[PDB]
Amino acid sequence: TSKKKRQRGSRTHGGGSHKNRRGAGHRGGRGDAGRDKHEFHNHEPLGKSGFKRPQKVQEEAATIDVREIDENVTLLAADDVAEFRVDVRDVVEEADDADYVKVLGAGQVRHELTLIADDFSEGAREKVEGAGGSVELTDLGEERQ
C-alpha cells in the first residue's frame, strides 16, 4: 500500500491545517521568487562572473591516462609488439570529434611502452620512460614552440 493510497479519510492529506495548501503564497511565490529576499538561503549569490570565448575558437582534447593503456596492453593483441608500441589515436574513443589526442600520466606503467600521440604531460613521459619506454610526438604534435 502506498502513502497516497492511505490518504482517503485524513481530510488534509498530510498538509497540516486545511488553511495551508492554497496558492503560491504557500511556496513564497512562484518558482524562484524571493531567491534574494525571504528565500535567499541556498541559492548561489547574484552576479556576473568571467567570460566565454566563442565556441568555435575552443579546442577539445581527447585524453587517456597511461593506466588505461597499460592495464590492457596484452589485451590489445591487435596492436604492435616489439623489443609494446601503441598509437594512442587508435585506442582513445571520441578521437574523431576531438581536436587532438593527449596522453595523461595517471596510474602506473608496468611495461615498456612506445606511445604515439598528439601530446603528453610531464607525468606521462616520466612514467613511460621510467618503465624503459619512449614517447613519440605525432606530426600534429609538431606544435610545440
**Per CB under 7 A, 59 contacts RNA:** yes
CA distance 88 to 103: 8
Q: Based on CB atoms, which residue is closest to RNA, 44 or 83?
A: 44
User: Of 59, 91, 61, which is closest to residue 76 (Cα–Cα)?
Assistant: 91
Q: What is the DSSP letter of 82?
A: -
87 in Cβ contact with 114 (< 8 Å): no
Of residues 12 through 71, those in contact with Na ion by CB under 5 A are 14-15, 18, 21, 28-29, 33-34, 36
Q: Considering only residues 86, 91, 101, 105, which one is a binding residue for RNA as defined by CB under 7 A? A: 105
Of residues 111 through 140, those in contact with RNA by CB under 7 A are 121-124
CA distance 63 to 100: 8
Residue 49 interaction partner, one of Cl ion, Na ion, RNA, none, beta carbon < 5-8 Å per kind: RNA
Shortest gap between Cβ of 132 and RNA (angstroms)?
14
Which residue type, as a one-letter code, is found at position 80?
Answer: D
User: What is the residue whose three cell numbers read 616489439?
Assistant: 82
Shortest gap between Cβ of 35 and RNA (angstroms)?
4
Shortest gap between Cβ of 143 and Cl ion (angstroms)?
20
Q: Contact letters (x/-) for Cl ion, 50-69, by CB under 5 A?
A: --xx----------------
Q: What is the DSSP letter of 51?
A: -
Max intra-chain CA distance, the chain = 82
Rule CB under 5 A: which residues touch Cl ion?
Answer: 52-53
